[PDB]
Design a protein around this ligand. Sequence first.
Ligand SMILES: CC#C[C@]1(O)CC[C@H]2[C@@H]3CCC4=CC(=O)CCC4=C3[C@@H](c3ccc(N(C)C)cc3)C[C@@]21C
Ligand SMILES: CC#C[C@]1(O)CC[C@H]2[C@@H]3CCC4=CC(=O)CCC4=C3[C@@H](c3ccc(N(C)C)cc3)C[C@@]21C
Ligand SMILES: [Cl-]
Ligand SMILES: [Cl-]
Ligand SMILES: [Cl-]
Ligand SMILES: [Cl-]
Lengths: 205, 205
Amino acid sequence: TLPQLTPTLVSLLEVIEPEVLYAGYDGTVPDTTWRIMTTLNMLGGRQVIAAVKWAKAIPGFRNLHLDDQMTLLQYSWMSLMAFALGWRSYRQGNVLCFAPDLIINEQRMGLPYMYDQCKQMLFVSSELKRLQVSYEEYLCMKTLLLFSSVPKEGLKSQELFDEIRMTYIKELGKAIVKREGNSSQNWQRFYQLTKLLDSMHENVT
Amino acid sequence: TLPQLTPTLVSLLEVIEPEVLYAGYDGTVPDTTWRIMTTLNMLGGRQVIAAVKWAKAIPGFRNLHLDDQMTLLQYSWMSLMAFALGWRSYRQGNVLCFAPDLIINEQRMGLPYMYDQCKQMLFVSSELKRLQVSYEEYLCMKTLLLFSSVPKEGLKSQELFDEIRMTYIKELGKAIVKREGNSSQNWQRFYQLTKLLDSMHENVT
Ligand SMILES: CC#C[C@]1(O)CC[C@H]2[C@@H]3CCC4=CC(=O)CCC4=C3[C@@H](c3ccc(N(C)C)cc3)C[C@@]21C
Ligand SMILES: CC#C[C@]1(O)CC[C@H]2[C@@H]3CCC4=CC(=O)CCC4=C3[C@@H](c3ccc(N(C)C)cc3)C[C@@]21C
Ligand SMILES: [Cl-]
Ligand SMILES: [Cl-]
Ligand SMILES: [Cl-]
Ligand SMILES: [Cl-]
């Protein structure tokens, strides 16, 4: 059984949450769309590396065939980064919190080419604010984003994948129960959190 | 009078067309969304620098107040790169020809996250193909895109800007006349090409 320091699967996902990355943005000097995009691209390059590090620490992940591990990251990596982005944003508004030293507030949103590049990602934060998602709900949902990005039958370890996925769904079930207690609305909450997860995989391919 | 080598203002825009930039993309090794986006961001950084050098070579541009020069590039730089992209694509099927060594054909468009990052830019090539735009119409339109990104009333050299802009509008009229000849449909083509320019400035600010 799980040690008392980390007695639930969700508390292991809390242990592997990476430290937030800083963008390296000046902020002493004035903003330009060019400065933001150039810094943002460097930041996204490192967040991809951090997201592969995080996925490889998820309990169960390293037990999939290495082709399955690569396939899952291939089909979910940017969706995972956008989901983390929505959460950070949510926790601070109608802002995009790319990094603590790089927040796209309403003013920066009006810099040229900035809103039209950003608009889509604002969906995520508003849905998390609309559903008042908890930290534990967020950690389960994020792991499931990684595990719901490819059909079981398009993978090599179909059976093991399916079992690990079902474990993470149940852990989400328990984050729901912990937050809002047991009720008839608990299935509704489960429907609206998993539908949210279905949106994040749209427009991947 | 203009020299006989370069007897028209459009033939001066021909002279300042930069040589095409190469992405530096291998293409021996297989494609991934990560490899394309990372290489594309390198290419975009250099294309911005080549777009600033091109604008500083347009007849009239260096005669504006330096604040006016900065403002015009600030409100048009990505629209210009997208417009040049549309034209390269048009000249080369519904592909996005970022560079000769980096073309997003239908296959690469299906790579994860790729179509959704690309879809908007397909508009430009479709309109240029729909209207059968000539190289000379294109060069005039591209300069006008730079000279219509800001109202003159928010500039320091209001009168000079207006005169330079009207010169390039007349140069477009003459590119229109050169191909289609004098017709009742010359004004229709002129509306079509300038409506197209109004789109390219949408979603800037
Ligand atoms: C503003 C803007 C924009 C975008 O071009 C669209 C979605 C962005 C993505 C979301 C997800 C995301 C979350 C972040 O917190 C910062 C970065 C980030 C991005 C950006 C990005 C830039 C470059 C890469 N490379 C090097 C792999 C990865 C991500 C910028 C993206 C693509
Ligand atoms: C796929 C994709 C994508 C995008 O994120 C949306 C529009 C692209 C832009 C168009 C206009 C454009 C035209 C090209 O021919 C290649 C590059 C290019 C881009 C890309 C770009 C990336 C980084 C910068 N920086 C460093 C200044 C500039 C341009 C990628 C853009 C922004
Ligand atoms: Cl700017
Ligand atoms: Cl299996
Ligand atoms: Cl890929
Ligand atoms: Cl003046």
